[PDB]
Structure formats: C-alpha cells, structure tokens
C-alpha cells in the first residue's frame, strides 16, 4: 500500500484475525490480511441510543485506537499541450495577472507549483498550481476537496507515454470512528454509531471488563441470525483458551459443546454475565450476553456524506441548481415531494420551492400574441 498511487485507499490501523474462523479462510489469506477487529460486544438495552439498527461505541476504546483507519486520496494533474503554441504551466499563479483565482490560499505552494510533502493542508487549499495561458492567463489549479483535510503524504513528478509532465499528490488523514459511521458483524447485522460513551458511563462486569460496542436485543429475533450469538460464545471461549475458535460451516461443534468449555473457564455457560450500571454502580436486574464478536468498519462514514446548500452554483442551460455534493449542488425536490406538498395543501410552500428556492425568472410577454417576443429595453 505504501508504494502505490491509487485514487483512494483505506487501511485499518490495528487489524485483528477473527477469533471465530473458517477452515476455508486458510486459502483466502484472510487471517494474514483481515477486514476487522474482535470487539467486546454487549447485546443490551442501555440508554436507547442503540435502537433501530444504531449502536453505542466505547469512546474510551476509540481513543486507544479501536477502529481508526488511515486514509489516502491521490490528486492528479497534467501539463497539457494545446497545439503549436498554447501550453499549460506548473507554477504559483500571481493574483494580478491570473484570472478567476480560487478563494483558497496559494501560499503552501513552492515555486514549482507543488506543496512539499509534510505540510498540513485543509479545505479549499491549493495542492497543485496550474495556469492555461490564453491571450494574461486563467487559473487551472487543483484545490483539496472542501469536505476533507489532512497532511500531504508524497508528491511525484513524471512524464507519460508521449512525455507530458504530470504530477501525482497523495494526501493522508486518519479517520477516527465518529457518530454516523457504519459497522457490521459477519451476519448482515449492519448499523451506524448512535453515541459514544466513555468507560465510566458504560455497563461493566464485576471482573472490570467493559463493552467496546452495545448492540440492541431487537436485532436478533426478526433477523434470526443465530450464528452471530454462536460466533460470540465460541469467540469468548477462544479468547480465554487461546485456541482458534473453529466457526466452520458443516461441523460437529454444538452450542452445548462450546457452553461446556465456557463453564470450564468460570463463566456462565450461555455467555451471560452479570453487569453493573455505569452511572449508579447498581447491578442490572438483567444479565447481559457479553463476549467478543468480529466487527467490520464499512466504507460509509458520515463526514463524507453530510451536505448542505443555500444558494449556490447553477446549471447554464436550465439556470437551476447544479448536481451532487461534489459540485455543491442543491437537493432534488422531486415529483414525489411535489405530491406530498399538494396532499398537505401547502400551496405557498410549494410555489416557493419551485420558484424562489430554485428556477424563478421574469419575462415580458405580449398582450396580443401571448409570446415572449417583447424587446424590453427596461432602462
């Protein structure tokens, strides 16, 4: 990973092999190159911040490196040749002789038009300085995505098949598990973080153990993901025994077999453990199903999703808001949304959405032939 320039690369800080494994994984290179970490998971009802597929994370564990990841994006740019005379250039543009400059800052550019690796960047800042001389010259520079930030990892200069100077810039960030951040077990049991609690707020075993993750009991029944519960029980034994827990498909391993082994370790056979409430210290009237379960960190993180707009770039043809988060677009108040407004009887709210909040324009029409013919020299 450290020697390749790819657009986007996500690497887990401290990957862990799973406590519960398949005999088939041997060939899949999975234990050598894992996709997650064995989290200490309590299936409990706690503050109600884990309702409807959400989960609670141990904010204490997150600090210790649980689920952090590296992030590398790579920005590219060419120095194109437009015919006999016109040639783009790598340089730090000067605002007096360069048109349509980016509002972002150009100070982090060395005179070769690149940021040296090691400089910390931030939104709207200029990674690569470029101008497309035409006459003095327009600004063709590359700014860092406005929704991101980080430190420049590496910057390389090259020529291609025909010898056009082109430069690749890598930017490294460390993404620390936040709220809308998605995670799942290996049982189609997905969810986002609802809240993160510190160790003291968390429920705890008399032994001093605390969950990394709190998942809701309400997941399990309707879903019938029994293997999730077994994964856990087996992983608990595996963790204590120091033996690889064989979670392979068609085998002679029984929930009874594993139960017996867990009782040999001092824990209650069905994985339950008595827990104490973190805020009061009072024993919970319920005993919580507690043990390690292999959880995966998924590509969907809240900060790459979050988007808001209030007047912005417009299309040329339709003169309406541009598309997508990427382009600082506006959202679509579509047909089905029009319908709801019509159902509500929100006549003026609708007019506003369709006019003031988007499209709205003024023409002069003729009273004889109701056409937009009128040569309004309004002045």
């Amino acid at each position: 990973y450290n020697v390749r320039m790819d657009t986007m690369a996500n690497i887990l800080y401290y990957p862990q092999k799973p406590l519960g494994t398949t005999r088939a994984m041997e060939y899949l290179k999975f234990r050598e190159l894992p996709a997650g970490q064995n989290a200490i998971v309590a299936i409990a009802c706690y503050s109600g911040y884990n309702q409807e597929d959400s989960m609670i994370m141990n904010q204490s564990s997150i600090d210790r490196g649980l689920f952090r990841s590296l992030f590398f994006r790579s920005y590219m740019d060419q120095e194109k040749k437009y015919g006999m005379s016109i040639t783009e250039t790598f340089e730090k543009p000067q605002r007096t002789n360069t048109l349509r400059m980016k509002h972002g800052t150009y100070d982090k550019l060395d005179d070769d038009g690149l940021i040296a690796p090691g400089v910390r960047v931030s939104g709207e800042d200029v990674i690569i300085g470029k101008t497309t001389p035409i006459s003095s010259k327009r600004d063709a520079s590359t700014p860092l995505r406005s929704t991101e930030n980080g430190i420049v990892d590496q910057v390389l200069v090259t020529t291609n098949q025909d010898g056009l100077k082109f430069v690749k810039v890598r930017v490294r960030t460390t993404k620390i598990p936040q709220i809308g951040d998605k995670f799942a077990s290996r049982h189609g049991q997905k969810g986002t973080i609802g809240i993160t609690y510190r160790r003291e707020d968390m429920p705890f075993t008399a032994e001093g153990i605390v969950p990394d993750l709190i998942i809701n009991p309400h997941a399990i029944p309707s879903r019938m993901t029994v293997a999730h519960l077994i994964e856990c029980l087996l992983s608990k034994v595996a963790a204590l025994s120091g033996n690889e827990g064989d979670a392979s498909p068609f085998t002679d391993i029984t929930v009874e077999g594993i139960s017996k082994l867990l009782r040999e370790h001092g824990y209650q056979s069905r994985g339950f453990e008595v827990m104490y409430n973190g805020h009061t210290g009072k024993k919970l009237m319920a005993q919580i199903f507690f043990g390690p379960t292999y959880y995966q960190r998924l590509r969907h993180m809240v900060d790459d999703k979050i988007h808001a707009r209030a007047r912005g770039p417009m299309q040329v043809l339709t003169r309406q808001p541009v598309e997508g988060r990427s382009r600082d677009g506006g959202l679509r108040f579509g047909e089905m949304e029009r319908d709801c407004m019509i159902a509500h009887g929100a006549a003026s709210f609708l007019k506003e959405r369709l006019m003031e909040a988007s499209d709205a324009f003024r023409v002069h029409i003729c009273g004889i032939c109701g056409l937009m013919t009128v040569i309004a020299k309004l002045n």
Binding site: S47, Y49, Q178, Y197, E200, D201, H279, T280, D303, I306
Partner: protein
C-alpha cells in the same frame, strides 16, 4: 467535524457558573440546581446523600441529554429548612465520609508488605 472539543466536558464555558440555583414553581420550599461541566460522578453521589437527610422531602437528579455535561438536581425540604443548606450539609457529610475513607485506606496500606 461536528465534534465538540473534549475539554468542554470539564472546563467551564465563557461566563458560565458551576451552579445556577432556580426556584421550583410547582412546589413549596423546592429548588432546582443546574450543575455545569458535571456528570453522574457527582449527581448520584449528592442525590443519595440528601436522601439520608431526614428534613429532605424530595431529591433527584437528571442528565437531560448526554451530549452536554450538566445535570439538574431538584431539592425539596420541610418548611423552615433551606434547600441550599440541605445541599451544603450533604456536600459536607460526603467530604467527611471520604476523609475517613482515605485515612482508613492509608492506615491499612501501610500495614501491607507488597
């Protein structure tokens, strides 16, 4: 990104008192103390000690939302007794109890040879 600074949990805000004592309207001789940059650590401790006070009629605390480190504590006492005084005494009792706890641990620790 929309993440609040970690010190916001314990470090008082610009012009923000630890305590804000407001009087309860619905009940006679009852008050509501809002504790800024505090959690269960202190709330449940105080509430439980006020419960030991005989002249205290009502005592409860609540952390209205977990994103904010603050809690409202409601104290109701018998007529003539002041709830601020009730809180003052429970605070004192706690300290004196902890003082003995330290003294007792220290004595017992010094006896150990490990």
């Amino acid at each position: 990104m929309n993440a609040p600074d970690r010190f916001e949990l314990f470090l008082l805000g610009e012009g923000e008192s630890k305590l804000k004592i407001d009087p309860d309207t619905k009940a006679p001789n009852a008050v509501v103390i809002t504790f800024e940059k505090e959690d269960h650590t202190l709330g449940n401790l105080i509430r439980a000690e006020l419960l030991n006070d005989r002249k205290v009629l009502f005592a409860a605390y609540k952390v209205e939302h977990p994103f904010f480190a603050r809690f409202k504590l409601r104290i109701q006492t018998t007529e003539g007794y002041d709830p601020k005084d009730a809180l003052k005494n429970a605070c004192n009792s706690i300290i004196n109890k902890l003082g003995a706890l330290k003294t007792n641990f220290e004595t017992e620790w010094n006896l150990q040879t490990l």
